[PDB]
Structures are given as C-alpha cells and as structure tokens.
Design an enzyme around this catalytic site. Structure first.
Site, PDB file in Angstrom:
ATOM      1  N   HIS A  61      -2.273-101.372  49.269  1.00 50.01           N
ATOM      2  CA  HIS A  61      -0.804-101.641  49.512  1.00 50.01           C
ATOM      3  C   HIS A  61       0.241-101.338  50.524  1.00 50.01           C
ATOM      4  CE1 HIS A  61      -0.774 -99.051  45.572  1.00 50.01           C
ATOM      5  NE2 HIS A  61       0.035 -98.154  46.547  1.00 50.01           N
ATOM      6  N   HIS A  91       3.158 -91.333  52.075  1.00 48.06           N
ATOM      7  CA  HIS A  91       3.106 -93.072  52.641  1.00 48.06           C
ATOM      8  C   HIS A  91       4.319 -92.611  52.891  1.00 48.06           C
ATOM      9  CE1 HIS A  91       4.630 -92.949  48.431  1.00 48.06           C
ATOM     10  NE2 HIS A  91       4.924 -94.362  49.042  1.00 48.06           N
ATOM     11  N   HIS A  93       6.363 -96.519  54.536  1.00 50.83           N
ATOM     12  CA  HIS A  93       6.724 -98.060  54.174  1.00 50.83           C
ATOM     13  C   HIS A  93       7.032 -98.856  55.256  1.00 50.83           C
ATOM     14  CE1 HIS A  93       6.238 -98.120  49.432  1.00 50.83           C
ATOM     15  NE2 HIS A  93       7.418 -96.428  50.112  1.00 50.83           N
ATOM     16  N   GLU A 103      13.237 -98.831  52.651  1.00 51.12           N
ATOM     17  CA  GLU A 103      13.651 -99.483  51.418  1.00 51.12           C
ATOM     18  C   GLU A 103      14.746 -98.395  51.597  1.00 51.12           C
ATOM     19  OE1 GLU A 103      10.285 -97.670  48.928  1.00 51.12           O
ATOM     20  OE2 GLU A 103       9.450 -99.981  48.816  1.00 51.12           O
ATOM     21  N   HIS A 116       7.478 -91.536  52.725  1.00 50.82           N
ATOM     22  CA  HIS A 116       8.272 -91.277  51.684  1.00 50.82           C
ATOM     23  C   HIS A 116       7.205 -90.204  51.255  1.00 50.82           C
ATOM     24  CE1 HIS A 116       9.826 -95.167  49.729  1.00 50.82           C
ATOM     25  NE2 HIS A 116      10.753 -93.967  50.208  1.00 50.82           N
ATOM     26  N   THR A 195       9.406 -96.748  43.696  1.00 49.84           N
ATOM     27  CA  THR A 195       9.518 -97.877  44.457  1.00 49.84           C
ATOM     28  C   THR A 195       8.410 -99.057  43.661  1.00 49.84           C
ATOM     29  OG1 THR A 195       9.757 -97.764  46.371  1.00 49.84           O
ATOM     30  CG2 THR A 195      10.877 -97.158  45.599  1.00 49.84           C
TER      31      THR A 195
HETATM   32  C1  LIG Z   1       5.223 -95.002  45.295  1.00 48.36           C
HETATM   33  C2  LIG Z   1       4.283 -94.205  44.788  1.00 48.36           C
HETATM   34  C3  LIG Z   1       3.652 -93.441  44.515  1.00 48.36           C
HETATM   35  C4  LIG Z   1       2.971 -92.530  43.658  1.00 48.36           C
HETATM   36  C5  LIG Z   1       2.549 -91.204  43.433  1.00 48.36           C
HETATM   37  N1  LIG Z   1       2.867 -93.462  43.037  1.00 48.36           N
HETATM   38  C6  LIG Z   1       2.329 -93.037  41.653  1.00 48.36           C
HETATM   39  C7  LIG Z   1       2.494 -93.173  40.294  1.00 48.36           C
HETATM   40  C8  LIG Z   1       1.395 -93.225  38.941  1.00 48.36           C
HETATM   41  C9  LIG Z   1       2.144 -94.081  37.545  1.00 48.36           C
HETATM   42  N2  LIG Z   1       0.901 -93.551  37.059  1.00 48.36           N
HETATM   43  C10 LIG Z   1       0.118 -92.684  37.347  1.00 48.36           C
HETATM   44  N3  LIG Z   1       0.592 -92.118  38.378  1.00 48.36           N
HETATM   45  C11 LIG Z   1       3.183 -94.882  42.522  1.00 48.36           C
HETATM   46  C12 LIG Z   1       2.756 -95.962  41.362  1.00 48.36           C
HETATM   47  C13 LIG Z   1       4.552 -95.684  43.789  1.00 48.36           C
HETATM   48 ZN   LIG Z   2       6.943 -95.281  48.432  1.00 48.10          ZN
END
Ligand SMILES: Cc1cc(C)[n+](CCc2c[nH]cn2)c(C)c1
Ligand SMILES: [Zn+2]
Ligand SMILES: [Hg+2]
Length: 256
Positions: A61, A91, A93, A103, A116, A195
């Site tokens: 993604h 990362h 977007h 975003e 981010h 997000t």
């Molecule tokens: C943009 C984004 C960044 C991160 C570290 N995560 C990890 C969060 C997560 C949920 N369950 C375990 N890690 C998500 C889902 C999205």
């Molecule tokens: Zn993000």
C-alpha cells in the site's frame, strides 16, 4: 483485503473496521480560519541526529523506512506532547497527478504528497501497546509540493527500483530523516487516528504548515511503484490516500 481501489477503498473500510466512522478519525481538513493559536503549546522538539534507519519495505500500500526504536535515538517531544515518542517508521501518500495525494488538506487544498513520520509513546513499552492507547502515537505530517528537488529524499528515490512490488524490501541503514524537514516547525495539532486500517484513534497529529518541495522526477519514481506482488498484473502505486474525514467537535490548534 483493504486497499485504495473502487472495491476495497476508503469507502469500504468500515465494514471490516467500524472505527472508520468514529469520533476522532484522520485525515481532516485544516480550516486555517477556524484553527486557534494556542499559547500553552511548548516549543516542538525533533531530535533526529542519532537516528538508525534499517530497511525499506513495499508493503503493498506504500513503502516504509523502518528505524531501530529499541533506544531513544530519534524522538519527538514538546508541543502538544507529554513525555517521549520514538520514531519507528516513515512513509508517504501520493497521487496519480500533482493536484492530489496529501491526506490532510489546508483550506480544502490538496498537496501532491504527504510524508508521515510515525512515533510511539515510550511509557507504553512497545508500538503494539501504544496503539491500544489514546495518547499512544504522535505522527508528524509534512506536505510535499512539486518544485525543486529535495536533496534528503534522493537516497529513498534511488532505492525504489529494488522494491517495486508488494513484499520486497531493501537494506537502508544510515539514512538521515533530518533531510526531509522543512525550514520552519510551525504546526497545526489535533487528536486523531491512523489513516490506514485498522484506523485506531491513538494519534496526536502534528501537521507542519510549510511544505517541502520535491522534483517532478522524484514524484514520478514514487508513481512507478506497484501495489501488486512480483509476477502479477501491474497495478501502479498511486492515489494511496484517505480523504479528509469529519472533524466532529474536535479543535485544531495552531502553534504560531
Ligand atoms: C499509516 C500506518 C502506520 C502504522 C505504523 N500502522 C500500524 C498500526 C498497527 C495496527 N496494528 C498493529 N499495528 C498502520 C495500520 C498505518
Ligand atoms: Zn500515513
Ligand atoms: Hg487508541
């Protein structure tokens, strides 16, 4: 599973992840005229000198640059924050076109991309425990516009050939995130969420007012990334953004 297309996109996420429609979801529109200067915000502290990047992952993604977070080496504190938050990953977007990709929006304006830098509250011990907490994460959001090249981004742009498809990762030690900041640390802050699924409402959002500019040829290489895994129909990695969500009572504070 969840994605960014017509069938698995942001408008389908609620079925599997009901907090999608919750009380403190991100991103949101930053109305510059509703945001209030906050005198009680202490200065922001971004300590990225001792930062230990390790690798870059195409997770299907986006791509993540991951850091060794086992020690206080790259941290956020100050501003709206109490105590210390460690950098775990960053990362972006971005869009298919320059007029979309961010975003958060500023007065309904969409920037070409959004960076981010994700941090977790150390008093919670690990990232997994902090995502179970309302003050668990602090994300530093930085807008990208197309203009002159961003020097500190180029080492990332050069590695993207090696992580084209979902699941591929490359070694990415000794990267300095300091090269990705703008000049100014002015910022809006609000209580929010991840997000991407699972959309957990664990984030203190710090969105910088001053964008960084990147080259047209830097964003072009972002747009060559694949959503798919090796040997699948090519699905380009573009428009991996969630649109702005309802503010719902919340208040955006300005640092300036
Ligand atoms: C943009 C984004 C960044 C991160 C570290 N995560 C990890 C969060 C997560 C949920 N369950 C375990 N890690 C998500 C889902 C999205
Ligand atoms: Zn993000
Ligand atoms: Hg939470």
């Amino acid at each position: 599973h969840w994605g960014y297309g017509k069938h698995n996109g942001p408008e389908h996420w609620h079925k599997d992840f009901p907090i999608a429609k919750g009380e403190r979801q991100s991103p949101v529109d930053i109305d510059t005229h509703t945001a209030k200067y906050d005198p009680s915000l202490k200065p922001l502290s971004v300590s990225y000198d001792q930062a230990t990047s390790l690798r870059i992952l195409n997770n299907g993604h986006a791509f993540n640059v991951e850091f060794d977070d086992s020690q206080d080496k790259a941290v956020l504190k100050g501003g709206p924050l109490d105590g210390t938050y460690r950098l775990i990953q960053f990362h972006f977007h971005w869009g298919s076109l320059d007029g979309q990709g961010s975003e958060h929006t500023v007065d309904k304006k969409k920037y070409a991309a959004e960076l981010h830098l994700v941090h977790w509250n150390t008093k919670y011990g690990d990232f997994g425990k902090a995502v179970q907490q309302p003050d668990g994460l602090a994300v530093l959001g930085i807008f990208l516009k197309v203009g002159s090249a961003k020097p500190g981004l180029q080492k990332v742009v050069d590695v993207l050939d090696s992580i084209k498809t979902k699941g591929k990762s490359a070694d990415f030690t000794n990267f300095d995130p300091r090269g990705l900041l703008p000049e100014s640390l002015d910022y809006w802050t609000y209580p929010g969420s991840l997000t991407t699924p699972p959309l957990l409402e664990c984030v203190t959002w710090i969105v910088l007012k001053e964008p960084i500019s990147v080259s047209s040829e830097q964003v072009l290489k972002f747009r060559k990334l694949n959503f798919n895994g090796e040997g699948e129909p090519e699905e380009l990695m573009v428009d991996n953004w969630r649109p702005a969500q309802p503010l719902k009572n919340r208040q955006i504070k300005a640092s300036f």
